[PDB]
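Q: Structure for this?
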Amino acid sequence: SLPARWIFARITPGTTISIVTDSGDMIGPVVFVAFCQVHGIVFVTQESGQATTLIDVDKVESVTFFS
Amino acid sequence: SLPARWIFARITPGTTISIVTDSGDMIGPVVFVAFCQVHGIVFVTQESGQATTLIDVDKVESVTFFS
Amino acid sequence: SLPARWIFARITPGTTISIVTDSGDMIGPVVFVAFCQVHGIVFVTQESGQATTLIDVDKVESVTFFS
Amino acid sequence: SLPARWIFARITPGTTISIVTDSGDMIGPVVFVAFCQVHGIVFVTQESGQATTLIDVDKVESVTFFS
Amino acid sequence: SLPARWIFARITPGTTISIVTDSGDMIGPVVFVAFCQVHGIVFVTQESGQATTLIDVDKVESVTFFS
Amino acid sequence: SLPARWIFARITPGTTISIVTDSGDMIGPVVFVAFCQVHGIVFVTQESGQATTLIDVDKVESVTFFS
């Protein structure tokens, strides 16, 4: 029902997206990893080693793709 | 009922608009593409290739047109 | 009932106001144009041609007048 | 009941206060004028002519006094 | 029940704390004075004379101590 | 049920994480200490002496790990 759950549910892993959130924190190019809906948590990670980011889907504004 | 639904429903695709959101993320001149209302989702895209931005209508503050 | 509806209902068109919103987006000197209350929408516009701005009244913080 | 209504109800007019809102917009030193509680609207103003500010009490974070 | 009420209830007066709010307004080193829970209002004050700041507890994010 | 409760309950103490909140206040490299889920409060602290931070979990956006 929530738009965030759908726009994150059908994204195949491995594609790089840029996500803007309710706080205005502009998160740069991050390769999508996973999204589990039963609890509503999306695993992403960007190169740093490796830096894994864990955010809450219900407070996600927008996702942008690149082609 | 929601103002965001109507201000995005009767706007023809192809027109360039500038949208300000609840997080203050000022998105520049972007050409409209589509707005599917049944699940409340709107598509925009700006030149980059092409950069498609996908946002949630319910958390959309304001749209501005140019003439 | 909502304070924003009242502070926008009795403003005569043509007067310039400065409006601050919930995102901190400071919108400069804009001449008021219209405010239709049944759906809660306010038409404003500033000189650019002309740049028309559409915002949601329910998510409007404050308006300031000049004398 | 609401704390904002209480902190605005018994401030005598003419005293200078500095208010801070939910958007982080810091209002500078202004002279308090009025607070009509039946609809919940505060009347403040700062010197410019005169610049009158109309901000909803329900979305006011904090007020600071000076001695 | 609210975490802010508890973290402000057991803080002894006179200790200097740094508080972050929902608007991101970072308030520097300020000595705690009082917090009355029945109406949910907390008083702080920093050196300026004296500058007393009055905020609403329900919209307080976090407090930090120093040792 | 809340995602923040999950991402905080099963982090072992001693690991350094970087948290981001609803206000965009970015918390730097801070070693996690504790999380009392009964009242929903996370205990963290960073080197200064020592500076302890007390931030409500329910208004926490995201946590990031490092490897």
